[PDB]
Design a protein around this ligand. Structure first.
Ligand SMILES: *[C@@H]1O[C@H](CO)[C@@H](O[C@@H]2O[C@H](CO)[C@@H](O)[C@H](O)[C@H]2NC(C)=O)[C@H](O)[C@H]1NC(C)=O
Ligand SMILES: *[C@@H]1O[C@H](CO)[C@@H](O[C@@H]2O[C@H](CO)[C@@H](O)[C@H](O)[C@H]2NC(C)=O)[C@H](O)[C@H]1NC(C)=O
Ligand SMILES: CN(C[C@H](N)c1ccccc1)S(=O)(=O)c1cc(F)cc(F)c1
Ligand SMILES: *[C@@H]1O[C@H](CO)[C@@H](O)[C@H](O)[C@H]1NC(C)=O
Ligand SMILES: [K+]
Ligand SMILES: [K+]
Length: 498
């Protein structure tokens, strides 16, 4: 419907420019008729989710790369894709004119955009905040009579979440995560630094903290917002670290285990919010499988844990097979979910690289890696940041898929936006990952899924410089003859009849 307005800032690719009167957008989603496939293509050279169609052919000859769909080899079902409504994201969005705000929210949450269905909501302040606060800063209020949502929630986050919900045709799921407790519940009496809850699981401090989760859900419910899930703590390992610079709350895996078993689990289960799922860990993958072993081998904790949330810091290397793979092998019935991902956090790299194709490829390669290790969903960090990668009260700036420039009432959609959208737009909630078998060794990254209605989707990423001819075979349907250009990403979709 409206194409990308490209702009280069000197990096390897372009951003797409939106403003008060223009943003790139799709027509209302429709499938091609039976016997045709759709291909959406983005390239470093500058194509952005461009649609072309081709025939599904009865026959294929030749010795080229064949990817055969394995529609009956079924793996995990998918919860979805989205990003985080931090204070920083909300401040950036609301600094835009109403029109530009709307085109930004449509980019992410409408079918004219990339159809996000997950929003992560911090419980009070984090590093991506300009104010340090909790919902219960009045000291020694153990019954939490003075628990309340400040304007960061009531004026910024909650109204934006409501507007995202109005634009979406897909049901949107909310996920809540706390960074710090009130300081009067903590050993160090500070929002940051090395510190945990005082006392031990099952006592007044731990019970007050569990009750704070319920008060949080109660308060959002008064605003007509219900949550799909909460995590047990954002990055619990961070609060074990001397000098930790921003909001945290330290738990060892044993501390998390006992807090869940004695306090958080029972308190949620006994509330009106008992159907809210509880996710453990919410932290980096090298803590697995150990953390999962500690928590999930205790039946009193295990009965309350619905999944394991993992963070992906895409700037750094870590094993996936020995972490996610081993966790899935040991605990196949506990879902894995990616609750936070980001790039640009190294102090020596520019936090925001406008038009970086490399950071786009980091996003899609991570998503593919996650899906191939049984992960059910993938959640970006801040939905929008400024050109500095902020605001952030400790200057812990990073990149975001959308960068707001309030001096021009403009926002820039990064390659990361398009790389995420190649998945989010085309993988509805309830889709199931299926197998995809290569006839020969090749340099491509790929994943296949089946939609709830039986339709196929395949994503193909080419991080190499070489154009790679290939054929996709759907044994029930026929062959898709195509090409994967160097530095491209493609999403293929087609109807399946038997
Ligand atoms: C928002 O951006 C659009 C697209 O860049 C601007 O419209 C362009 O304006 C230039 C200069 O007049 C023309 O050469 C283009 O033909 C226009 N493009 C389109 C698609 O209309 C628009 O002026 C910007 N709006 C605001 C409020 O700054
Ligand atoms: C478990 O659930 C019941 C409600 O079904 C909670 O009972 C209420 O507790 C609060 C204080 O926490 C009182 O102000 C209410 O008067 C109680 N209402 C009823 C109907 O009993 C109970 O406290 C919950 N257990 C917890 C939070 O540990
Ligand atoms: C190992 N694969 C790459 C190989 N060239 C390939 C491509 C297509 C069909 C089969 C195999 S992969 O399964 O696609 C994969 C696994 C990962 F763990 C992370 C990836 F990014 C990608
Ligand atoms: C496919 O293969 C068979 C020959 O083996 C042929 O009859 C048919 O015409 C071929 N072409 C198409 C387009 O089906
Ligand atoms: K308060
Ligand atoms: K940086």
């Amino acid at each position: 419907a409206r194409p990308c307005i490209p702009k280069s800032f000197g990096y390897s690719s372009v951003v797409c420019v939106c403003n008060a009167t223009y943003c790139d957008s799709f027509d209302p989603p429709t499938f091609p008729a039976l016997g045709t496939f759709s291909r959406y293509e983005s390239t470093r050279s500058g194509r952005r989710m461009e649609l072309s169609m081709g025939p599904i052919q009865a026959n294929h000859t030749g010795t080229g790369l064949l990817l055969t769909l394995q529609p009956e080899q079924k793996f995990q079902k998918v919860k979805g894709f989205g990003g985080a409504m931090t204070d920083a994201a909300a401040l950036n969005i609301l600094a835009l004119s109403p029109p530009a705000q709307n085109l930004l929210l449509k980019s992410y949450f409408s079918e004219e955009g990339i159809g996000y269905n997950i929003i992560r909501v911090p419980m009070a302040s984090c590093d991506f905040s300009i104010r340090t606060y909790t919902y219960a800063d009045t000291p020694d209020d153990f019954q939490l009579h003075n628990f309340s949502l400040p304007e960061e929630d009531t004026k910024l986050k909650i109204p934006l979440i409501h507007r995202a919900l109005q634009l979406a045709q897909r049901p949107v799921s909310l996920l809540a995560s706390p960074w710090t407790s009130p300081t009067w519940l903590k050993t160090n009496g500070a929002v940051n630094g090395k510190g945990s809850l005082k006392g031990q699981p099952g006592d007044i401090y731990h019970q007050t903290w569990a009750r704070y989760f319920v008060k949080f859900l109660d308060a959002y419910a008064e605003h007509k917002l219900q949550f799909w899930a909460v995590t047990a703590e954002n990055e619990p390992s961070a609060g074990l670290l001397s000098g930790y610079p921003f909001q945290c709350l330290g738990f060892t895996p044993e501390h998390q285990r006992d807090f869940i078993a004695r306090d958080l689990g029972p308190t949620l289960a006994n509330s009106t919010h008992h159907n809210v799922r509880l996710l453990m860990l919410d932290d980096q993958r090298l803590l697995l499988p150990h953390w999962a072993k500690v928590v999930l081998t205790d039946p009193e904790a295990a009965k309350y844990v619905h999944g394991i949330a993992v963070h992906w810091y895409l700037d750094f290397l870590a094993p996936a097979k020995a972490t996610l793979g081993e966790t899935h092998r040991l605990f196949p019935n506990t879902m894995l979910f990616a609750s936070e991902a980001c790039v640009g956090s190294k102090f020596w790299e520019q936090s925001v690289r406008l038009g970086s194709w490399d950071r786009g490829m980091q996003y899609s390669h991570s998503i593919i890696t996650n899906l191939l290790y049984h992960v059910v969903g993938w959640t970006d960090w801040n939905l929008a940041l400024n050109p500095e990668g902020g605001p952030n009260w400790v200057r812990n700036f990073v990149d975001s898929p959308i960068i707001v420039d309030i001096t021009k009432d403009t926002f820039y959609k990064q390659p990361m936006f398009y790389h995420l959208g190649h998945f989010s737009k085309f993988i509805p909630e309830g889709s199931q990952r299926v197998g995809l078998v290569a006839s020969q060794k090749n340099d491509l990254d790929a994943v296949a899924l089946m939609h709830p209605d039986g339709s196929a989707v395949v994503v193909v990423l080419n991080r190499s410089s070489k154009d790679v001819p290939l054929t996709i075979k759907d044994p029930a349907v026929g062959f898709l003859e195509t090409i994967s250009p160097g530095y491209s990403i493609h999403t293929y979709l087609w109807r399946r009849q038997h």
